[PDB]
Design a protein around this ligand. Structure first.
Ligand SMILES: Cc1cc2nc3c(=O)[nH]c(=O)nc-3n(C[C@H](O)[C@H](O)[C@H](O)COP(=O)(O)OP(=O)(O)OC[C@H]3O[C@@H](n4cnc5c(N)ncnc54)[C@H](O)[C@@H]3O)c2cc1C
Ligand SMILES: Cc1cc2nc3c(=O)[nH]c(=O)nc-3n(C[C@H](O)[C@H](O)[C@H](O)COP(=O)(O)OP(=O)(O)OC[C@H]3O[C@@H](n4cnc5c(N)ncnc54)[C@H](O)[C@@H]3O)c2cc1C
Ligand SMILES: Cc1cc2nc3c(=O)[nH]c(=O)nc-3n(C[C@H](O)[C@H](O)[C@H](O)COP(=O)(O)OP(=O)(O)OC[C@H]3O[C@@H](n4cnc5c(N)ncnc54)[C@H](O)[C@@H]3O)c2cc1C
Ligand SMILES: Cc1cc2nc3c(=O)[nH]c(=O)nc-3n(C[C@H](O)[C@H](O)[C@H](O)COP(=O)(O)OP(=O)(O)OC[C@H]3O[C@@H](n4cnc5c(N)ncnc54)[C@H](O)[C@@H]3O)c2cc1C
Lengths: 416, 416, 416, 416
């Protein structure tokens, strides 16, 4: 204890005057290859709209809510006001955007905050889309409209403690009963699960021994989703462990499209493209912050940006960014032309996430001390990126998916 | 909100049964080149003692206190029971260890927790040692005995918001008054400062225009140290912003050894060696955890350690570790023989911290999902390492110190 | 000596049957993101034409001539038959291609052989273009037609032993005499110089103290260009040391466009873009070879492409390639739109050359033993790439050019 | 053709005066951690002796013979005068050195030239040692004395075109005949084979279906060893393809120790340690050259060693070197204490060779243009290192050997 131990933290205005925190978000200096040429007039407008609605409403409060690992619920309606939820889904009260537009949207969110980016992505590109492609016409018209407006929040539940990367061999059972199903099993890592209204839980149809999709409602008897604590990244994203004991799902709430796991590998085709755009966004932000910081912070009687070592670090980031964008952009134009294959998308996410790590690592050390402060974005984004490298297919798995497709030989399984 | 939103987190026994958390700390499988051969019988005994007293008393509680960013005060006496505080200092109620022993001690702490390692290092190798080398015989006999037993905690205050890497050009003034001094200025990043009894504050002697050392007592009128929040690493270490308004320091509490900043560069010679040993420790822990995890966690019907990609990652870590140790060991044997130069020590810290990052980065991705959980050590240590890469001389500064010494040409300042 | 010491090398058919050498060049499996979409119908046709005319006429003989470090002169007319020399130059008997087309042309040459790529690039993009932009209408109509058909070969002479990266401070003097000039000085590294008909030598106009361009004819009295030996890369490219003792250049053969070094920085704008495309080409070839080799060579009772470690290496190359291409492609579309700046082009070359090294390094180790054989392309290209990383602006210089432009602060000069 | 095309290359004194070539070899500035402390008085004397006898007799001529890919036979007796051949072998006219001494000897050779280092290593650590451990007392007393003096040269023949990394499944047959054996099969990559007096050829004992060792004499009827051309590294090392048609080996010339391939894995235990020391040596040389070059070559009105970017590159090399040495040193002290295991040695070679590549890559780019010239060592050593990364167990194989030992699970074979 001390007479000054209880006193509130020093204001950033007094504690470190030389540099401007992320509270007032940096200008877009990462767009060095003038990317608006690769975007359509409408895509450009969505890009600008999201960017502004993020620097205004999320940028100030994000620093506080990340430390507390609490979700900023009062921001939800502001995100549904951007018109991004639903994204790729056409009709059913959804914006109906192009894959390039829905991707550049994700970017300009992850740029300011990766946490709020994953929240929407899991809800929109995994939750909503699964209903939009595998659901029935009765389900699409029922749920989607409210989900696109963010009045109701959905979550995607494929992963288990026992089965992660080997997702196709999951152990949650879906026993057929009169009038519906009884879902029994456990889930781990599901974002939004602790507060989600709709829980798209994947389970094993005990009759067919195949994987089926189920829309599980909130608070449903036998369902218990508890918060996963102590995350170093994506701290605002409420990830949880789901328990399922005789959870009833009526025949009307089973997804008719999912009848094996191969059916899921059409939703993932969009999901993998969209996740691939998160690092593209994050890295841009990391640069934008570094560019300003190195120009504001003075040491040895000169801005940091004047020193050879710092410049080489900055341009390596700038170079990594330009390539990462073009990579993700091309990936979209492959999906749009309808000639995109699992391997191309798996290469996309893997490569981009890898260079994003390098870019984040350089950015983090460039700010030195304040490089470990979430006040200055880079530190938060450095941490925020680590799960992204792993989730939606770990680097190693993706590189092996692209491996299998190109070589023609599968090398996933062990020897034995 | 939800009926299950408020419910406590799922126990690790139920949430993820396949793997054992850091609560029960991993066995020492990182010692692959059998390092006990490089240590003396007495050094070996200190190594073992600390390791055990860390896996017992810190290992269980560390996960909880890291998330809360709170210091575990009830552990303090247990650390002072290890007989590590003081370390290199001979006499004055200190253990009187060899530089190799005091280094291997730091390692086996940082191995289990980097936070508690920095706490002691700043207290012992920076605080206590400054008094031991630059203090008067009257000061050494007065403070050191209590500081070695951890009844009183000391902190080192050189860095400022305006002056960080350019430490020799600091702006905290030490105006001479009748009977003592009036310290005026600001400090940033000082570990333990918020609860430290002794504050070794460096200020500019306004009469000589040189840097002098001052022992500032706790609660002293005009002194205000506030906690720095939102750190991604070393979260338990209470780092703070120090304010100083006409803080009186009597003539008896001025360090007579510090007459310019060059005098400090004899304390730093030990401090830089000791910090260099933190990554060596941390990385060993990161390995020990990975080795078990890859052997416990099963996927695709085999332990993770069976897959080619995972093995190459693991052995790269094992290789990085063996070299890091030998590097730090040699560094000690250079200081011990008395032929160590600033450049050698600067190369030591820089190189080791660099490979520690690589080792931590691999380790973090090896655990996949649980790679972002502080429950599993790696994530915490991954974050914990980032400030260490920067503090006690940033990588770039150190590489330039070694640069200046070898080439003969100084390349720190800008052009202009 | 031995009874078998003098005997000719074993045929590749008997010495290593499992794999096919570069003699029969690999199919295009590096084009994974289907790049023909980014090219125009005419650009596609040039791409195909060059690729075929390289796999037929150069691919067999390249292995032999690289080892001997001799230029394949009997291939010259076959290269001038492709219609690539001149490239960007409109009229004057030149093909008049787009910057994207002239870039994709360079790629499909460097793909098969980097040596023959540099030969043409130095001749066309540096030699011919300098005349086309800085020469007089009388000079353009006189030389260019024959240079485009490869009946006459030109070389570019800016670099000196004393002045390399600091090119603007060169020491070759151009003393004004009656009716012309007397060029005095030394040059180093000039490709084609030993056999070039036209030598575009840059010298210092002693009257204005500025840099001027001079067309020096072959065999001119006082001129002596000797071959530089012992190169590990670009061995077929005849690089030489040029000596100049009172070499007369008539007033008609002075380039009227070059009156300071700033005038050169418009030719370099194309030259830097074109060099940036060499690694893009080379790396594609390196992949194409690896993809086949890993599928042909069998070990442990399976093709190399079946092993996890080898796949991860291959896909990292494939990923590096797709990005490198998009990067160079975008760079062209920046020059084409006329909004390209020195910094963007400097980022292009730097980044691409850097990833090309990584890609080459992986490719070289993938072939193992035969990875050091020029018979198998990769080894040759691995070596061939090293000068490219350095010449046309070293990585460090380029990263500093992009540094200066973005930050606004120049950090080229030393302290002192 | 030209009047100056046939003229001999420009002397290095005139062509590039600013820097000193490798002809006059650089001073030892790579020994930054003062390594003579880790060596015995006798080891120090051997280190110095070899270093001097290399800088005098090999250093001038190496540049010429590397380009021509010819072996400098007139240097052989000078190498046998150093007293290094035999090395570890006790008695039988061999020097009888310690493993640490024989390793530091290899280093100080590979430092000046890697080619001459491999020549001796294959002869001494693979050839001679195989006889010393697996040969009979009659064979040791017969061959070794002459082999240690370098009057006779031996070579090691395990690898085949069909079987490389999978060495234990080789296909050279050893059919038993009256009075001896008939060796039938093919070999590839054998150093010295084209001029070696003794050819230690490994073949499959057709009776036991196991691997046996055979001493095949030079010029033996049915034996034909042809030179392998077009190598980018170790160009002086005469590597060859061996043909064997009914080559008779009398019962007296069969190695009685080699009864299966497991017996070989005691010779390799020394061979792998010794190869591991080649990069340690090479990298030291690469540094020593860079340190001088960056201090001699001036650009922008300052030595290259004055620029931040160049210093960071240089110290990364210096750091990589100090660790590489300690790593190899520790490895020796593990073999010496008799507690070294295949995995430790496999980690040694793998890790060291990996960092040697990094160190060589940096060194090569530091010299810029002259970084591709064998005149300046770095380029030659950069190339020379590439096979070393692969031969004596490729990086991937070694990392998997260390993988198997630590994890307990073997991951060499494919699935299928
Ligand atoms: C958690 C933690 C605990 C700490 N505890 C203490 C403590 O107890 N006591 C104490 O005194 N200090 C402490 N520090 C502060 C630390 O000493 C400083 O952060 C560091 O020494 C200087 O970095 P900076 O924050 O001032 O950033 P800067 O000095 O501004 O450096 C930022 C970046 O600029 C680069 N740079 C700076 N100068 C040059 C140059 N000349 N040439 C090329 N590049 C350059 C650096 O490489 C760095 O990446 C602590 C820091 C941390 C993170
Ligand atoms: C914060 C975050 C949010 C998440 N949100 C969701 C969500 O909303 N919905 C959802 O369904 N999931 C979610 N996940 C879970 C995620 O999908 C899984 O973590 C991941 O797909 C599988 O990793 P794992 O945790 O099971 O570790 P593992 O699958 O056990 O993998 C651990 C390591 O082993 C390696 N490995 C595994 N198999 C092989 C192999 N065959 N060959 C070589 N190496 C192999 C991997 O490379 C990895 O490094 C989230 C995860 C995180 C971190
Ligand atoms: C100049 C030089 C000198 C040599 N001298 C000798 C000599 O004197 N005596 C002698 O006996 N040999 C010698 N060798 C041969 C050497 O031993 C072999 O090259 C090497 O051991 C096997 O490599 P390889 O050429 O057969 O390629 P491969 O064995 O086919 O390997 C190619 C690639 O495949 C990868 N790979 C192979 N198996 C696996 C697997 N199971 N899992 C994952 N990846 C795998 C490797 O990592 C490698 O990158 C020499 C080689 C060179 C280059
Ligand atoms: C095979 C090949 C072909 C070539 N062909 C031609 C040709 O046809 N025409 C022609 O004109 N030239 C040619 N060149 C020469 C080439 O342009 C020069 O090599 C290069 O531009 C300058 O490098 P340098 O050799 O002078 O080394 P240096 O300029 O001395 O550079 C050496 C190192 O110092 C570093 N360095 C230099 N200055 C700085 C600084 N200010 N700050 C930080 N680091 C610095 C660099 O990064 C580099 O690593 C060729 C070179 C090669 C290798």
């Amino acid at each position: 204890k001390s007479s000054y131990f209880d006193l509130p933290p020093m204001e950033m205005s007094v504690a470190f005057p030389q540099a401007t925190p992320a509270s007032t978000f940096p200008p877009c200096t990462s767009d060095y290859y003038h990317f608006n040429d690769l975007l359509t007039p409408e895509e450009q407008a969505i890009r600008k709209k999201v960017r502004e609605c993020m620097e205004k409403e999320v940028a100030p409060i994000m620093t506080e809510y990340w430390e507390k690992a609490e979700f900023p619920f009062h921001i939800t309606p502001k995100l549904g006001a951007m018109g991004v939820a639903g994204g790729s889904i056409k009709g059913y009260g959804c914006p109906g955007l192009s894959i390039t537009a829905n991707a550049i949207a994700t970017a300009e969110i992850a740029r300011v905050d990766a946490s709020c980016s994953t929240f929407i992505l899991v809800h929109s590109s995994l939750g909503m889309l699964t209903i939009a492609l595998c659901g029935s016409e009765a389900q699409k018209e029922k749920y989607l409209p409210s989900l696109a407006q963010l009045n109701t929040v959905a979550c995607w539940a494929l992963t288990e403690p026992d089965n992660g990367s080997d997702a196709s061999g999951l152990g949650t059972t879906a026993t057929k009963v009169e009038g519906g199903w009884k879902i029994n099993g456990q889930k781990r890592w599901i974002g939004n699960s602790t507060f989600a209204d709709l829980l798209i839980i994947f389970a094993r149809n005990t009759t067919t021994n195949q994987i089926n999709g189920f829309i599980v409602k909130k608070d449903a008897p036998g369902l218990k989703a508890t918060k996963i604590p102590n995350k170093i990244g994506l701290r605002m994203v409420q990830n949880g462990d789901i328990l399922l004991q005789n959870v009833f799902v009526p025949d009307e709430d089973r997804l008719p499209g999912v009848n094996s796991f191969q059916d899921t590998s059409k939703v993932l085709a969009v999901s993998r493209v969209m996740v691939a755009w998160q690092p593209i966004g994050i890295s841009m932000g990391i640069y934008d912050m570094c560019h300003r910081y190195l120009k504001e912070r003075k040491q040895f009687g000169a801005p940091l940006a004047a020193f050879q070592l710092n410049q080489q670090k900055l341009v390596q980031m700038l170079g990594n960014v330009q390539a990462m964008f073009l990579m993700g952009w091309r990936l979209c134009k492959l999906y749009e032309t309808g000639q995109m294959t699992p391997g191309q998308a798996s290469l996309g996410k893997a490569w981009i996430s890898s260079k994003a790590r390098e870019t984040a690592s350089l950015g983090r050390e460039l700010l030195g001390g304040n490089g470990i402060l979430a006040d200055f974005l880079v530190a938060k984004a450095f941490c925020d990126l680590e799960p992204i490298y792993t989730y939606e297919g770990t680097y190693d798995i993706n590189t092996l998916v692209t491996g299998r497709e190109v070589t023609g030989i599968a090398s996933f399984k062990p020897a034995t």
